[PDB]
């Protein structure tokens, strides 16, 4: 019996598990005036300025110092990609709740700008994401989960074609999240991979389904 | 049915009694449904697949269950046969049902009682509420002096008065006062008020202290002290957790020193009789059964604690008796040695309570020597008390006892300072003297 006749009041309680069970993933199902989609001098820089004005936290302030010194223009991004990426990953691994919304948001936008060159960071980008998600389990924060899985969904959305072409490796990368022993990890990670698979065309889909069924025989004992 | 039956037992007051007794005996009585069990058949398999969606799981389960039953048809024939056969177990409360009926119609029990006294003299096992309702019946009896076994009932009834639950004590006084005699008629209210918790201490100092108004008289005291003694025994068994209850126990012991010598000795006899020592003293020093239970150990512990307080309150005037105080104390300390030697160190709780028992008993012996000492003989028991001194102690007395004056060492020193008691030093090859050396 989930809350179905709303109380007249305005501030309810909504424990953690309630929030997560109410949580879903799709942003295109979602919609709003996205800043990066709005202004176009560069997507990363757009989000970067909005967040510098909005977020006042130690980690993001440090990160903003370093990078605002570096990036101001798309050629500068393209030239200094590695330094920016290492900085983002350094802070994400710092795992600070107050700074993660801007850091993950900037990561998604960083891929959006850098698309077909982002693949050389792709693998350990994903490693860092999954580490963050397990640590988030430790320090429960439904907001953290919302941000992290939306970063994954956005990365898939921006790198649709290449990931689709090399689909099965993505499934191998996500299988820790996919078979993870937590209902909502299974639920969300599968929703992201769901977007990607629905995008995929027929032939790679056949290869994918074969590979995943043989993985199922691999984890025959596992049910998750 | 409870509102009907008390009008028709009159029409039949024999079959109703038979049914009542049948139920009383009934739950303790064994019930068996050892039905016919055929040979087992291992016919079973994963007939269908296993899915996650719940209602599919459910229907698959129903089908698999039916399939399993049919594959193992034979035993399942038996099982379905049983379930349609139905039960024959009387619910366990049926004894309380019958007892409540018995309460409803007391005079029938007062009539027969022949099949009831076996329960009392077996001391029931039964549940506390059932015991209580049965004692309520016994209070409801009218001609109680003329029951089947009046005096054996009376003894068990005194024991129930000696019990510790104050409600059980109230019921036992109700029965013992259903027994009619003018002295207890005179002291009815006094005893009932003594049981009542609030008026307890005021009552003690009211009519128990000697040479006062409303004091008990001589013939009266002879006939009533056993009741008073059992009541005080329960009051003492109150365990001392709070300041108020500590004061309660202390008040009981501190009114003790005014009764009389035989009465005090009899009170201590109560303590020992709840305890036991004819094991050794029908043997010599050898335990018949390895009854090393916490049960008997805490029994001994309560006995020695009651004795320690008794000494501390009567420390020169109290009587000593070999068959009521001296011997059971010795049994206690001997048992402590025995258990401590016999069982390993895995039994922490037993071991700790045994050590505490040994401490308390030795302190008690030291005390009693200090406190009566020369005032009566020991020759009858010198050998035995020396024995229980010296089995474990003289071996390592010097090694163990050197930091503070121990109770045992104080015992030895009293022996030495008193001349007529040189007999222990004498009694061994001066093992005690050499230990001191």
């Amino acid at each position: 019996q989930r809350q179905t006749t709303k109380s007249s009041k305005r501030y309810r309680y909504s424990s953690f598990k309630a929030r997560i069970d109410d949580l879903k993933i799709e942003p295109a199902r979602n919609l709003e005036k996205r800043v990066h989609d709005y202004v176009e001098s560069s997507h990363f820089l757009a989000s970067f300025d909005q967040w510098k004005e909005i977020n006042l936290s130690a980690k993001f302030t440090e990160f903003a110092a370093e990078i605002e010194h570096d990036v101001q223009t798309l050629p500068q991004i393209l030239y200094h990609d590695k330094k920016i990426f290492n900085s983002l990953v350094s802070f994400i691994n710092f795992h600070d709740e107050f700074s993660l919304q801007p850091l993950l948001d900037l990561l998604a936008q960083f891929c959006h700008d850098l698309g077909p060159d982002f693949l050389k960071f792709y693998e350990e980008a994903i490693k860092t994401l999954i580490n963050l998600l397990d640590a988030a389990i430790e320090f429960e924060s439904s907001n953290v989960f919302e941000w992290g899985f939306n970063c994954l969904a956005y990365i898939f959305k921006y790198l649709s074609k290449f990931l689709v072409k090399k689909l099965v490796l993505t499934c191998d990368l996500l299988i820790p999240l996919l078979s993870h022993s937590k209902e909502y990890l299974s639920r969300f990670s599968a929703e992201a991979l769901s977007f990607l698979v629905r995008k995929c065309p027929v032939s790679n889909l056949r290869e994918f389904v074969r590979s995943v069924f043989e993985k199922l025989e691999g984890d025959d004992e596992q049910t998750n | 049915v409870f509102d009907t039956l008390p009008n028709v037992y009159t029409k039949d007051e024999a079959l109703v009694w038979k049914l009542v007794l049948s139920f009383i005996k009934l739950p303790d009585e064994n019930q068996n449904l050892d039905y016919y069990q055929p040979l087992l058949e291992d016919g079973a398999n994963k007939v269908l697949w296993d899915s996650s969606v719940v209602r599919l799981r459910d229907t698959i389960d129903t089908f698999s269950h039916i399939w399993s039953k049919y594959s193992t048809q034979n035993t399942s024939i038996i099982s379905t046969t049983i379930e349609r056969r139905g039960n024959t177990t009387y619910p366990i409360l049926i004894r309380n049902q019958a007892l409540k009926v018995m309460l409803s119609i007391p005079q029938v029990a007062e009539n027969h009682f022949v099949d009831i006294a076996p329960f009392v003299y077996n001391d029931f096992s039964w549940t506390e509420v059932d015991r209580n309702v049965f004692l309520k019946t016994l209070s409801k009896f009218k001609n109680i002096k003329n029951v089947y076994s009046a005096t054996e009932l009376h003894d068990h009834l005194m024991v129930l008065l000696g019990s510790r639950n104050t409600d059980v004590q109230k019921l036992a006084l109700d029965a013992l006062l259903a027994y009619k005699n003018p002295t207890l008629n005179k002291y009815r209210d006094n005893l009932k008020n003594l049981l009542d918790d609030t008026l307890f201490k005021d009552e003690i100092t009211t009519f128990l202290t000697e040479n006062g108004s409303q004091s008990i008289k001589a013939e009266d005291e002879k006939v009533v002290m056993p009741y008073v003694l059992r009541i005080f025994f329960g009051r003492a068994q109150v365990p001392p957790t709070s300041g108020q209850k500590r004061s309660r126990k202390i008040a009981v012991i501190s009114v003790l020193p005014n009764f009389k010598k035989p009465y005090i000795n009899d009170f201590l006899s109560l303590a020992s009789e709840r305890l036991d020592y004819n094991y050794f003293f029908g043997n010599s020093h050898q335990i018949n059964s390895s009854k090393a239970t916490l049960k008997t150990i805490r029994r001994m512990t309560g006995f020695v604690n009651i004795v320690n307080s008794t000494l501390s309150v009567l420390r020169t005037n109290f009587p000593l008796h070999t068959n009521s105080v001296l011997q059971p104390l010795i049994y206690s300390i001997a048992m402590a040695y025995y258990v401590l030697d016999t069982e390993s160190t895995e039994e922490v709780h037993l071991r700790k309570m045994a050590s505490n028992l040994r401490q308390q008993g030795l302190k008690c012996l030291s005390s009693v020597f200090e406190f009566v000492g020369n005032t009566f003989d020991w020759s009858t028991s010198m050998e035995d008390i020396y024995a229980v001194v010296v089995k474990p102690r003289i071996s390592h007395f010097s090694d163990e006892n050197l930091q503070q004056p121990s109770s045992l060492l104080r015992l030895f020193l009293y022996w030495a300072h008193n001349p007529s008691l040189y007999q222990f030093l004498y009694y061994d090859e001066f093992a005690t003297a050499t230990a001191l050396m």
Partner: protein, 246 residues
């Protein structure tokens, strides 16, 4: 009046809150707590009137109930909590710590504070006694009871207190030549060194103090508060450093 009062007029407020005389008829009466009525700053007067992070009482209550404000490490949801002197109020979503300390003009000055300095708090040892079961305790100037103190901590001292554990990291004795902050009367906000302690038995001990420009004033022991040794304060002093000028 037949019981405690629950209201505070606006003219009757403590003056150092700088409350305008027309915006309303009532002022936030500070709830009972660590600091006395008249020398405390409630969280609404701090979050709305000083920080300007709010515009209403209902905005201030929204902030508190959303659980942002911690007064000495613990989360406070009472909107008239009497935050007092030498207090540490942290707003994490803004990444700020505030030591509440007096400005030269008398008023509470916001003092922005870093994390390693927000980690602790000074307290004026004010009553040393022997508690039940024989454990001795100190009572500081904001209610705090601290057991098992150093035996050499005497009344009128300072103890630097680790907030994360409610414990005493160390202390400072009330001797001549220490640095002194002043918290009452005409000179409050004035930091100087303690020259003399003229002590009267049965009356009020006065203290003679000398600020860095060698200007001397006389206050009461009730109003002296020892901060640190000469030239090194244990806390970070607000600007101007308690020098009254022309």
């Amino acid at each position: 009046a037949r019981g405690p009062k629950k209201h505070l007029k606006r003219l009757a407020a403590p003056h150092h809150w700088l409350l305008d005389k027309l915006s309303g008829c009532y002022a936030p009466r500070p709830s009972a707590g660590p600091h006395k009525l008249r020398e405390s700053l409630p969280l609404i007067v701090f979050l709305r009137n000083r920080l300007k992070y709010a515009l209403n009482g209902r905005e201030v209550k929204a902030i508190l109930m959303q659980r942002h404000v911690k007064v000495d490490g613990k989360v406070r949801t009472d909107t008239t909590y009497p935050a007092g002197f030498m207090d540490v109020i942290t707003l994490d979503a803004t990444n700020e710590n505030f030591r509440l300390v007096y400005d030269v003009k008398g008023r509470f000055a916001v003092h922005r504070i870093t994390d390693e300095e927000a980690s602790y708090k000074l307290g004026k040892v004010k009553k040393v006694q022997l508690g039940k079961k024989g454990v001795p305790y100190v009572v500081t100037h904001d209610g705090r009871t601290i057991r098992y103190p150093d035996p050499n901590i005497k009344v009128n001292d300072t103890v630097k207190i680790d907030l994360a554990s409610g414990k005493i990291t160390d202390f400072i004795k009330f001797d001549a030549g220490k640095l002194v902050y002043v918290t009452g009367g005409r000179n409050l906000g004035r930091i100087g060194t303690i020259v003399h302690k003229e002590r009267h038995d049965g009356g009020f001990d006065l203290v003679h103090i000398k600020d860095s420009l060698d200007n001397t004033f006389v206050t009461r022991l009730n109003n002296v508060f020892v901060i640190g040794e000469q030239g090194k304060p244990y806390i970070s002093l607000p600007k101007g450093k308690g020098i009254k000028l022309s």
